[PDB]
C-alpha cells in the first residue's frame, strides 16, 4: 500500500501553433491512483483533439493535436488514491 | 467603389464546453473586402476544428467545433480593401 507519488512530473514546454503536444507523467501508488488533468484549475474536457491516455508502468499522458494559442496555460496533474493525494504542475506556452 | 463597412457585426456569446460556435459578420465594400480573424489580437490559425468561411452576400463566419475553455477571448474581424479598413470585436466566453 502506498499513496500517490510522481516518479516523472510535468515540465514547462513552449510549442508552435500547429504542433502536437504531449504532457507525460509517471505515477506510483497502490491501489493505482486515479489521475486527472486540469488547465488553469478547471477540468480538461476531452474532445477529438485533446484527450488523456493511460499506458503501462503508470505513464499518464495528455495529448493535444495541432496546438492553438488558447491551449497555453498552467496544467495540473492530480493523482488520488485511498491513502493520499498528490499533484504537479507546469506551463504550456504556444508560439506563432 | 466603397470602403469596407459592417452591415452585421460581431456580438458577445457565452457557450458551454463541447458546443459548436459560429461568429458571423456581413461586410460590404467594392472591391470585396479581405476579411481576417484575430483572437486577443493574434491571427486565428485554422485547423480542422476552427476555420473561416466566406458565403454569399458578404457573409463571413468563424466556426469553432466543440468549444474548449481556451477558445474564450476577444475576437476581432478585420476588413480591408483599396479604399479603407474597418474592424469590429466581441467576446466569447465558455462555461463548463
Curated annotation (Swiss-Prot), chains A, B:
Isoform 1 is preferentially expressed in striated muscle. Non-kinase form such as isoform 3 is predominantly expressed in the aorta. Isoform 3 appears to be expressed only in highly differentiated ASMC in normal vessel walls and down-regulated in dedifferentiated ASMC in vivo. In response to vascular injuries ASMC dedifferentiate and change from a quiescent and contractile phenotype to a proliferative and synthetic phenotype. This proliferation of vascular smooth muscle cells is one of the most prominent features of atherosclerosis. It comes from the Eukaryota. May be autophosphorylated. Residues 4-93 form the Ig-like domain. Interacts with MTM1. Isoform 3 is found as a monomer or homodimer. Belongs to the protein kinase superfamily. CAMK Ser/Thr protein kinase family. This is Striated muscle preferentially expressed protein kinase. It comes from Homo sapiens (Human). The chain holds residues 866 to 961 of 3267 of the full protein.
Amino acid at each position: 500500500k502506498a499513496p500517490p507519488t510522481f516518479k516523472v512530473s510535468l515540465m514547462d514546454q513552449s510549442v508552435r501553433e500547429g504542433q502536437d503536444v504531449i504532457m507525460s507523467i509517471r505515477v506510483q501508488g497502490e491501489p493505482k491512483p486515479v489521475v486527472s488533468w486540469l488547465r488553469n484549475r478547471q477540468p480538461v474536457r476531452p474532445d477529438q483533439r485533446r484527450f488523456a491516455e493511460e499506458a503501462e508502468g503508470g505513464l499518464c499522458r495528455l495529448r493535444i493535436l495541432a496546438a492553438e494559442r488558447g491551449d497555453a496555460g498552467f496544467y495540473t496533474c492530480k493523482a488520488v488514491n485511498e491513502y493520499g493525494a498528490r499533484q504537479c504542475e507546469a506551463r504550456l506556452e504556444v508560439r506563432g
